[PDB]
């Protein structure tokens, strides 16, 4: 799925495409608001914490 | 039907306006105001259908938005503003003053009045109540409220009103034998004194009226507007002086003035 990541300290944004259901799997059952550590998703994201804010499904 | 109605089908217009049958479909609908819908004369009507100053309705807005016309002292810029009986219409340019007052056929007559008389008016007091904080007020037929009237002033008396100021400057009691203008009914327009009042507790006093031709008729109280003394009116009357002639008498007048 596609990730829509914003750094709201810099008011920046850019999207990331994650394939591999194993890396994707970290977000499952996590809600909106819940925090998510980064390394799981990518080795770039190590250190980073993500807040889940929303998104869109297919359709 | 869901809300305030906002149009007026020509034909449902009051007749004393003398609008034509065709040429259109609607008549102007009198805005809310000092005078009731059906006993009013919208500015549009006066500026175009009587005075012939405008040809269009479009030119009535044009005349008005330059603040040419002013009613009862104040300017007024509503095309269909409800002018009414006793009100005073003024054109500063053209140096012209008017009072709205009835025919003998029940219509609003074009009546030129002098610049001084053009600065006051008469009001039938319609109710006199004690208002909040103990202040007594009167209310006149054109919906003015006037605080602190004369204690002697009661309902049905007429009242002389400054205009330049809000205040009353004189009043006339509803008595046996006082000049009366009839405002409603068939005898709309007739003028004459008062012979006596029928009482009828619980609905519609009757006022027996005689004019200066020893002719007599009756109306509901409601329709009687005191305006002075036998002789002394407190405003100028239109030519005819509210006397009403038979169709014969009117025929003979009109065919007496015949030789060019």
């Amino acid at each position: 799925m596609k990730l829509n990541i914003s750094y709201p300290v810099n008011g920046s944004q850019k999207t990331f495409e994650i394939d591999d259901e194993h890396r994707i799997r970290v977000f499952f059952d996590k809600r909106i608001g819940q925090e998510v550590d980064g390394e799981a998703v990518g080795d770039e994201f190590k250190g980073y914490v993500f807040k889940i804010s929303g998104g869109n499904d297919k359709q | 039907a869901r809300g305030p109605k906002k149009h007026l089908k020509r034909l449902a217009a009051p007749h004393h306006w003398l609008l034509d049958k065709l040429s259109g479909c609607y008549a102007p609908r009198p805005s809310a105001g000092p005078h009731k819908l059906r006993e009013s004369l919208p500015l549009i009507v006066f500026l175009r259908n009587r005075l012939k100053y405008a040809l269009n309705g479009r030119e009535v807005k044009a005349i008005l938005m330059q603040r040419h016309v002013k009613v009862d002292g104040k300017v007024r810029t509503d095309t269909t503003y409800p002018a009414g009986f006793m009100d005073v219409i003024t054109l500063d340019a053209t140096n012209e003053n008017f009072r709205l007052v009835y025919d003998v056929k029940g219509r609003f007559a074009v009546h030129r009045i002098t610049d001084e008389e053009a600065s006051y008016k008469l009001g039938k007091v319609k109710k006199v109540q004690l208002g909040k904080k103990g202040v007594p007020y009167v209310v006149t037929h054109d919906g003015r409220t006037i605080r602190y009237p004369d204690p002697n002033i009661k309902v049905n008396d007429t009242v002389k009103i400054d205009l330049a100021s809000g205040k009353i400057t004189d009043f006339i009691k509803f008595d046996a034998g006082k000049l009366v203008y009839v405002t409603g009914g068939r005898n709309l327009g007739r003028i004459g004194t008062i012979v006596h009042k029928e009482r009828h507790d619980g609905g519609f006093d009757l006022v027996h009226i005689k004019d200066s031709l020893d002719n007599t008729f009756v109306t509901r109280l409601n329709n009687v507007f005191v305006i002075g003394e036998q002789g002394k009116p407190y405003i100028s009357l239109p030519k005819g002086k509210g006397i009403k002639l038979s169709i014969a008498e009117e025929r003979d007048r009109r065919r007496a003035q015949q030789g060019l």
Partner: protein, 134 residues
């Protein structure tokens, strides 16, 4: 071209619209109705105000030939005509340009298309430009 004769009846000096207004009653023997340009060109040289502040219309010519009756206006200035005259009239004369536009229902259709958009639009141009990849 046969004397004619322009008569003006029922006349009202109308300050609150800056003009004199009147009936125009034209006798025209042996001349089938006179025309409006002639009537402003002439009435000008009567009411001392010059053509392009004289307005004229109404006008149907009488049954059986001879006469036409219309209506006339003469403004105190050309500044005043150009502002108190109906704009189609100024067009007839040559004092205003017929700024013609889209069909009345072409306009309506543009209004209704425009209702489908919320905001300026150009946001929607770029976003819909991305589509050209999916």
């Amino acid at each position: 071209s046969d004397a004619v004769t322009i008569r003006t009846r029922k006349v009202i000096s109308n300050p609150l619209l800056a003009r004199k207004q009147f009936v125009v009653d034209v006798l025209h023997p042996n001349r089938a109705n006179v025309s409006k340009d002639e009537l402003r060109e002439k009435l000008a040289e009567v009411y001392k105000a010059e053509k392009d502040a004289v307005s004229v219309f109404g006008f149907r010519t009488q049954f059986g030939g001879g006469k036409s009756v219309g209506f006339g206006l003469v403004y105190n200035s050309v500044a005043e005509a150009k502002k108190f005259e109906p704009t189609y009239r100024l067009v007839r004369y040559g004092l205003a340009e017929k700024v013609e536009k889209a069909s009345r229902q072409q306009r309506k259709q543009k209004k209704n298309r425009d209702k489908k958009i919320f905001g300026t639009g150009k946001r929607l141009a770029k976003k819909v430009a991305r589509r050209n990849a999916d």
